[PDB]
Each structure stands twice: as structure tokens, then as C-alpha cells.
Design a protein around this ligand. Structure first.
Ligand SMILES: *[C@@H]1O[C@H](CO)[C@@H](O[C@@H]2O[C@H](CO)[C@@H](O)[C@H](O)[C@H]2NC(C)=O)[C@H](O)[C@H]1NC(C)=O
Ligand SMILES: *[C@@H]1O[C@H](CO)[C@@H](O[C@@H]2O[C@H](CO)[C@@H](O)[C@H](O)[C@H]2NC(C)=O)[C@H](O)[C@H]1NC(C)=O
Ligand SMILES: *[C@@H]1O[C@H](CO)[C@@H](O[C@@H]2O[C@H](CO)[C@@H](O)[C@H](O)[C@H]2NC(C)=O)[C@H](O)[C@H]1NC(C)=O
Ligand SMILES: *[C@@H]1O[C@H](CO)[C@@H](O[C@@H]2O[C@H](CO)[C@@H](O)[C@H](O)[C@H]2NC(C)=O)[C@H](O)[C@H]1NC(C)=O
Ligand SMILES: *[C@@H]1O[C@H](CO)[C@@H](O)[C@H](O)[C@H]1NC(C)=O
Ligand SMILES: *[C@@H]1O[C@H](CO)[C@@H](O)[C@H](O)[C@H]1NC(C)=O
Ligand SMILES: *[C@@H]1O[C@H](CO)[C@@H](O)[C@H](O)[C@H]1NC(C)=O
Ligand SMILES: *[C@@H]1O[C@H](CO)[C@@H](O)[C@H](O)[C@H]1NC(C)=O
Ligand SMILES: *[C@@H]1O[C@H](CO)[C@@H](O)[C@H](O)[C@H]1NC(C)=O
Lengths: 435, 88, 193, 97
């Protein structure tokens, strides 16, 4: 009942958070999947003609929404701030977060490391139609998907525009701070921004200016540690990989489901129309059509459910960008484990990777405390901080750093009569006015 | 205007079989109004060097519109106004 | 179980969940709000409640002059909460509905096996023991195509229910992270006041 | 324009909030449900063989999710603080929880 632990040192930690934003936009042609380029089948599909656009009114409703998830996340600023020529903002090294002007690439080092980790060459994201016509490439899965009228529409924003958005966001964070989300950007030196961000945690601003070099070294070491950890590992972006794998396996299942005959005598339209006359060939083709509509229906339903899940993740990403980047958040364990300082967004294939910078106290110490001190019959309570004892003296400190101060009347406020407070002690309060 | 998915502009009439098409279809397989994007050959709209907002999105950072006789143009979408902040 | 519809057990038992709950409550009581950031820091409960009072707008001299009244009010509120869970009968209706929906869906899936889907019978034994193999394949295939639809509908409805349960689980995780491991300033998020 | 109401007393209230977290995980066997333990039916189900694993890739996708929904809620601490031997934390009674 009279013991308290007060930290004496701290640490700065940079953590990763990977969230998907969008999936692959897909379009489906009813003809060349149900009726394989045959005139006899296309004369029978018209009776099901209202059952097809209902698919194309759904798959085209997801895809435009897939271009709304990205621009809600990244395009949160109406100004494109240019990247500064320097990367040393008072000891804080921003070299590997911002793009390098002396390189042909428009993406930074960590952005380059996030790429070439997601194997995008498993689906039909980049596949020309020239090599699909001839050669052994006709045995590929993508060639069959294209020959069966299943394409993948390209995204609106390229990777260069998203990289420019992230570079503008990081430049606005470095040169302006929290004030470029409200109105016009207001310049401020980065040490003052760090001091103000420290003052919103419970640590007074004199702590930063007495430990600027140590904090700069810790930040640089943490950035170098997270940068090296993205090369040795093999599984760190499994969330973004699962989306590509799921879409590719769903399209492959939809392609491979054409080998089922659905109760007919054959699974192809060519050996049915070349064996049976038109009297009884219409009762086997219709079974195939009614069976091949169900595969498209199931694919559309599963795509809609996955689109809803991806939209939920994109809304969470947009909220995290609006709250944990453009300002400082007081929500516990929202961005990063601990006391949040600031965050940096990095692009990834169909996803966003957040680097959260967090403050954690490290080394504790036992202490004996007291709820209040009464001097001459009147109780004194601490204004900001707690009363503490080092063994022989009584001081008043802050709750997140051991910085002892002499108990005066400028840091205490008076109340009570010390007959009602439980645990009150006897001590003297220094008066700074004596002639 | 007509956009073909993932083809080259030289190979448009070969992969569309322009000999068997209608005479009105053959004007959209070649001509002076040909643009090459990362999504494929766009035939029907002229390309301009200006940058505006997006009206009809195509893909790979291309947006078409109906500008001034009037005709369909194509360009690259503008992300925003370029700005600078003096830091010291 | 005779029709191949089983329910798999959960990974976490009730004892482990109760241990997690007891650990969270003990960490809140002894350490406070500081065990969700880094290492747990001990502090007396009176000073912790004084600091939590200071986050509202009430100064900390109010609690030390009224500690017994606040303690008695908290104890009476806890007692009134405990007795209100014995007399009532409809207070966990959400979880009861969650259980009942799954049970009713599985029962409906079992009972949907009595439809012949246009065939001459709803069972595979009086179809294969009357008609020869020439014309029995046109009736068994109708039953198979009919019985695939029931599984498809069941899987789709289970997916939708799983999506809404995942949304509620994310809300519960946010409530546990923001209100148990600290004190939130969001109006009407956890509590009323 | 010159009147204000200020409270003079307070009260401490306890409010319960019930929330579901997980539901019942389910597995479905294709061959037992569709074909009533008969060899003639199972010889025709093979052509529908791609339609069944797609079912078992969905329900098994739900169940492994339901073991996560719990661990996101309750498993938010990496340390097991033992319950103290006392239940009187400065007058506040913790004996029920
Ligand atoms: C907190 O810990 C850091 C190390 O993480 C200490 O930083 C050292 O400070 C001394 C001078 O005080 C320097 O000579 C060292 O180079 C610093 N680094 C290391 C790695 O030792 C810091 O002093 C600690 N603060 C305390 C104990 O109050
Ligand atoms: C703290 O100081 C007060 C005020 O002096 C003490 O209360 C009385 O102190 C006088 C001497 O000043 C003693 O003769 C009385 O016996 C004290 N009365 C009581 C009821 O204690 C008080 O004892 C001091 N110590 C503490 C722990 O409160
Ligand atoms: C004074 O404030 C202005 C406006 O906030 C700053 O902005 C512009 O800076 C550029 C580059 O130096 C100048 O060419 C412009 O004339 C400035 N004004 C405007 C309205 O565009 C300016 O940098 C600030 N002054 C200094 C010396 O930093
Ligand atoms: C606020 O209301 C409570 C009752 O809800 C009052 O508490 C009483 O306080 C007196 C001393 O002030 C004690 O002797 C009583 O035992 C308390 N309880 C009851 C049930 O009477 C409290 O005084 C009120 N505060 C005010 C009016 O300022
Ligand atoms: C910042 O980091 C880069 C890359 O590691 C390094 O070359 C440079 O010396 C560091 N410091 C400054 C002040 O740019
Ligand atoms: C703290 O608790 C101990 C053990 O019960 C007791 O002796 C002591 O008086 C208490 N101190 C205060 C200030 O309540
Ligand atoms: C299509 O054009 C691109 C870009 O110029 C070129 O790299 C590619 O080789 C061309 N394809 C063919 C088949 O000529
Ligand atoms: C548009 O830009 C291209 C590429 O630089 C150039 O060749 C062309 O002349 C420009 N057209 C104009 C300015 O009308
Ligand atoms: C706390 O509540 C329990 C259960 O009603 C009771 O037995 C006990 O006396 C109360 N007080 C203390 C100080 O434990």
C-alpha cells in the first residue's frame, strides 16, 4: 500500500503493421465460358439472357470499389509536397524512408525491400497475349484463363503514383508535423516537433533536449534493425500473399470445373453436336448450361464476400492513416504497443505497411510513496506527478521518468485538513518567497 | 474509343482478324489515333501532354474525357497541385 | 453424426479463458494501466483511483475525502449486479441466439434429405432396387444435383454468419484493448457517462 | 443567459455489456451426406469431385478463423500475473470477480 515503481530509462521501438487494401479486379464473359464458340449453343443462351448481366452488374460493382479502397487510404492530401534535399532532420536520419534523387528508381530502400518479397508472378497480373498464341506457353494456366474469357483488369493508380503519395506524406510529416492535416502546412524544426510529441505522453519537454543524441541514435539503430530484418526473413507479408494465392486458386478452380459433364454424355459441346441429332441434342446441352451457370454464381458470391472483407480492412487502414499519421493518437494499443509518437506509411503490392515509432520505459526502481503531505494543518496534493522517497528525503516526480524535484508551493495545491486523508504524512514544503 | 487488353499496337489487326471484320470495324484497328499504354492499345482517342482530373478511368494512370469540334482525348491523371514548404 | 455433420471442439478450453480473465483482472488491480505499455508497475489502489478520477475533470482531493462512500457504492453496485443475474432469465440472449441459429441450421440441413428433387423416391435404396442400371443413372444424378445445393446454401450462410461474428469479435478486441487496459475518453464507447 | 447548473453529489454505477466472440466450428463430409454408403452412388460423385473440396476449403477456412477470434480478445498479455492472496485493495472488494 506504500510502494511504487518509477522508471529510470527508456527505449524507442519501431514496429511493422501490414494490412491489405485491395484485391485483383476480375471480369467474366458469359459467352466463351458457357458456349465454347459454337453457334448452336449461342442460340440457346438467349433464354437465360437475364441471368448473365446480373453477374456482370456484380463483378463490375466490385472492381470500381477496388479503386475506391486505394484512394481513400493514400490520397488523403490535396497537395504534393516535394521531397527535401536533406535527410538529416536534427540527427534523425530519413534517408531510407524517402526516395533517393541519385537513383533511377522512384521508390525508397524499404519500399524496394517490400517489393520482391510478394511473388506476384503466380496469377495473370502481367502476361502478354503474343506468347499465348503459340509455343509451349499454351500449356500455361494463364493462357487457359484468357482463352476461357477470364481476364484481370489493371488498377487505376500505378505503383509510382502510390510511391509519390507516400513520399509526399512522409515529407509533410517531416517538414510540417501534425498541422498539415487541418489546413495549410506550417513549418517547424523537427526537434520542436519531437518535444511537442513527447509532451503529449506525460514526459516534460526538458527530457528530450537533454537526451537528443541518444534518441537520435536509438531511432537510427531501430530503423537499421527493421531494414535488415526484411531481408533475412522469408515469411513477413503472408497477409498480402494469401490474397494473391486465394484469387489465383479460385480462378484455377473455375477453369478446371469445365471438365464435369453435369449428367450429360460428354463434357464438351463438340462430341455432342457431332453424335446426336437436333431432336435430343437440346436436352444434353441445356444440362451443361444449367450446370455451368452455377460455377459462375458461386464464384461471384465468393468474390463478393472477399470484397466485403477487403473493404473492411481498407476502412481500417484509412482510419489508421487519418489518425496515427496525420496526428498523434491517445487510443491504447491502436498503433503500436506502448505510447505512440508518430508513424510512417510504406507501399506494398495491394497493401500498406506502417512503421510505428513507440516509446517504452525500461528500468524500474522500488520507492515508498504517500498520497498527500500536510504541513501546518492543511493538506497539500501534487499538481502533476507523485510524491516519492529515496530513503531519507521526499521529492515529487513525474509518473513516466525519475526526475526528482524539491517539493515547493509552485507544484502543489492545498486542500483539506489532514484529518480525512488516509495515509497522510508529515513533511515540510519549501516557500520560494523569503526576504 | 476501343481499348484492347494486353496487346501491342502493331499486332492489333492480326489478333483481331481485320480481314474478316466489317468495313466499319476496320477503322478501329489502325489509323492516326493510336496510343500505347501499359494495359494495351487505345485506338480512337488522341493523346495530349496536359494533365487534368479523371473523368473516364482506363487503367495504369490513364483517364479519358470529352474535350474540345469536340473529340475524345486521353491523358494522365493529376494527383494534386505541386507544393513546397520552406524548412529551416 | 450419422450423416457426416460433426462439430469440432475449440482450441482454448474454459479453464484457459478463465485464467486469461483472472490474469487481466489481477494486472489491472495490482499494476493498473501501466502493464499494457511495458513492464507492470506497482501502485496502491487508492492512488490509482485518484489518478483515474483526475482524468475526468474532478480534482483528486474529492476521492480522499470520500473514499469510504466510493468503496461502499462500488460494493453495493457489484452486489446488485450479482443478484440481478439470478432472478432474470433473458440477459445473454445474443449468445443463446448464436447457439440456436447454428443448431437450427444443422437440423434443417439434416431434415432436407427427404426431398426427392423430382425423382421417384427420396432414398437411394428403393431406386437402385427397382430400376436397372440403364435408367437409374438419370434419377441418382437428380438426387446428387439436388443435394449439392443444400451444402452450398449451408456454406454460404455459415460464411455470412462468420463475417458478422468476426465484426463483433473485432469490436470486442477494441473494447478490451482501450477500456480495460486504460481509460478512454470516447463518449458512450464503454459505459454511460 | 446567466444561469448554470452544477452537481453537488455523484454515484458509481456498474453496467454489463454482452458480446459474442466465436461460434460453433463445423465440418461436413461429402460422401456420407450425398451417397448413403452405397457403391453405385460414389462412382458418379467422382465427376463432381472438384465441387466438394471447394466446400471443404471454405468451412475449414471458417474454423481456423474461430480459433483466432478468441485469442485476439483474451490473449492480450504475454505474462500470467498470479491472483493476489488478498481481496481488499484499499476498501474495494474484489472477492466476486
Ligand atoms: C539508458 O540506457 C542507455 C543505453 O541504452 C544509456 O546510454 C549510454 O549513456 C552513456 C552516458 O550516460 C554513454 O556513454 C553511452 O554510450 C550510452 N550508450 C550505451 C549503449 O551505453 C543511458 O545512460 C541510460 N540512461 C540512464 C541510466 O539514465
Ligand atoms: C504529524 O504531526 C501531527 C501534528 O504535530 C501529529 O499529531 C499530534 O502531534 C502532537 C505534537 O505536535 C502530539 O502531541 C500528538 O499526540 C499528535 N496527535 C496524534 C493524534 O497523533 C502527528 O502525530 C504526526 N504524525 C503522524 C504520523 O501523523
Ligand atoms: C515566408 O513565408 C512564405 C509564405 O509562407 C514562404 O513561402 C514562399 O517561399 C518561396 C521560396 O523561398 C518564395 O519564393 C516565395 O516568395 C514565398 N512566398 C509565397 C507566397 O509563395 C517563405 O519561404 C518564407 N520566407 C522565408 C525566408 O523562408
Ligand atoms: C451524497 O449522497 C450520499 C448518499 O447517497 C450521502 O452519503 C451519506 O453521507 C453521510 C455524511 O455526509 C454519512 O453519514 C452517511 O452514512 C452517507 N450515506 C447515507 C445513505 O446517508 C452524501 O452525504 C451525499 N453528499 C452530499 C449531499 O454532499
Ligand atoms: C543516414 O543513413 C545513410 C544510409 O545508411 C548514411 O549513408 C548516412 O551517413 C546517414 N547520415 C546522414 C547524416 O545522412
Ligand atoms: C499498509 O498496510 C500495512 C499492512 O496491513 C499496515 O500495517 C499499514 O498501516 C498500512 N499503511 C497505510 C498507510 O494504510
Ligand atoms: C510490345 O511493345 C513493348 C513496348 O515497346 C515491347 O517491349 C514488346 O516487346 C512488344 N511486344 C512484341 C510482341 O513485339
Ligand atoms: C507532347 O510531348 C511529346 C513527348 O515529349 C512531344 O514529342 C510532343 O511534341 C508534345 N506535343 C505537343 C507539345 O503538342
Ligand atoms: C467482500 O465480499 C465477500 C463476499 O461477500 C465478503 O465475505 C467479505 O467480507 C467482503 N469484505 C472483505 C474485506 O473481504
Amino acid at each position: 500500500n506504500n510502494s511504487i515503481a518509477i522508471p529510470t530509462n527508456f527505449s524507442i521501438s519501431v514496429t511493422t503493421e501490414v494490412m491489405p487494401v485491395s484485391m485483383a479486379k476480375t471480369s467474366v464473359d458469359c459467352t466463351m465460358y458457357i458456349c465454347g464458340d459454337s453457334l448452336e449453343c449461342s442460340n440457346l443462351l438467349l433464354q437465360y439472357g437475364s441471368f448473365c448481366t446480373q453477374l456482370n452488374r456484380a463483378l463490375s460493382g466490385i472492381a470500381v470499389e477496388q479503386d475506391k479502397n486505394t484512394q481513400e487510404v493514400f490520397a488523403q492530401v490535396k497537395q504534393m509536397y516535394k521531397t527535401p534535399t536533406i535527410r538529416d532532420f536534427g540527427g534523425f536520419n530519413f534517408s531510407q524512408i524517402l526516395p533517393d534523387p541519385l537513383k533511377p528508381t522512384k521508390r525508397s530502400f524499404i519500399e524496394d525491400l517490400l517489393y520482391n518479397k510478394v511473388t506476384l508472378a503466380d496469377a495473370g497480373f502481367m502476361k502478354q497475349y503474343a506468347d499465348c498464341l503459340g509455343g509451349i506457353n499454351a500449356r500455361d494456366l494463364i493462357c487457359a484463363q484468357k482463352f476461357n474469357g477470364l481476364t484481370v483488369l489493371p488498377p487505376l493508380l500505378t505503383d509510382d503514383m502510390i510511391a509519390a503519395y507516400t513520399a509526399a506524406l512522409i515529407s509533410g510529416t517531416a517538414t510540417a508535423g501534425w498541422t498539415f492535416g487541418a489546413g495549410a502546412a506550417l513549418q517547424i524544426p523537427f526537434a520542436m516537433q519531437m518535444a511537442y510529441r513527447f509532451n503529449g505522453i506525460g514526459v516534460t519537454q526538458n527530457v528530450l533536449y537533454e537526451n537528443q543524441k541518444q534518441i537520435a541514435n536509438q531511432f537510427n539503430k531501430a530503423i537499421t534493425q527493421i531494414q535488415e530484418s526484411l531481408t533475412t526473413t522469408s515469411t513477413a507479408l503472408g497477409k498480402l500473399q494469401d490474397v494473391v494465392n486465394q484469387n489465383a486458386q479460385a480462378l484455377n478452380t473455375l477453369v478446371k470445373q469445365l471438365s464435369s459433364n453435369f449428367g450429360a454424355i460428354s463434357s464438351a459441346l463438340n462430341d455432342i453436336l457431332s453424335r446426336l441429332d437436333k431432336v435430343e441434342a437440346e436436352v444434353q446441352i441445356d444440362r451443361l448450361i444449367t450446370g455451368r451457370l452455377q460455377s459462375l454464381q458461386t464464384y461471384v458470391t465468393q468474390q463478393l464476400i472477399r470484397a466485403a472483407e477487403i473493404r473492411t480492412s481498407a476502412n481500417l487502414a484509412a482510419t489508421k492513416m487519418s489518425e496515427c499519421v496525420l496526428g498523434q493518437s491517445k487510443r491504447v494499443d491502436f498503433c503500436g504497443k506502448g505510447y505512440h509518437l508518430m508513424s510512417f506509411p510504406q507501399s506494398a503490392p495491394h497493401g500498406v505497411v506502417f512503421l510505428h515509432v513507440t516509446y517504452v520505459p525500461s528500468q524500474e526502481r522500488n520507492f515508498t510513496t504517500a498520497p498527500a503531505i500536510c504541513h501546518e494543518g492543511k493538506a497539500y496534493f501534487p499538481r502533476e506527478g507523485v510524491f516519492v522517497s529515496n530513503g531519507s528525503f521526499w521529492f515529487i516526480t513525474q509518473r513516466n521518468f525519475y526526475s526528482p524535484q524539491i517539493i515547493t508551493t509552485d507544484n502543489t495545491f492545498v486542500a483539506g485538513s489532514c484529518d480525512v486523508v488516509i495515509g497522510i504524512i508529515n513533511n515540510t514544503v519549501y516557500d520560494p518567497l523569503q526576504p | 474509343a476501343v481499348l484492347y487488353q494486353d496487346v501491342n499496337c502493331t499486332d492489333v489487326p492480326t489478333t483481331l482478324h481485320a480481314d474478316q471484320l466489317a468495313p466499319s470495324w476496320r477503322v478501329y484497328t489502325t489509323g492516326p489515333y493510336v496510343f500505347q499504354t501499359q494495359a494495351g492499345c487505345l485506338i480512337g482517342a488522341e493523346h495530349v501532354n496536359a494533365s487534368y482530373q479523371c473523368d473516364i478511368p482506363i487503367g495504369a494512370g490513364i483517364c479519358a474525357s470529352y474535350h474540345t469540334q469536340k473529340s475524345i482525348v486521353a491523358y494522365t491523371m493529376s494527383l494534386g497541385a505541386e507544393n513546397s514548404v520552406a524548412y529551416a
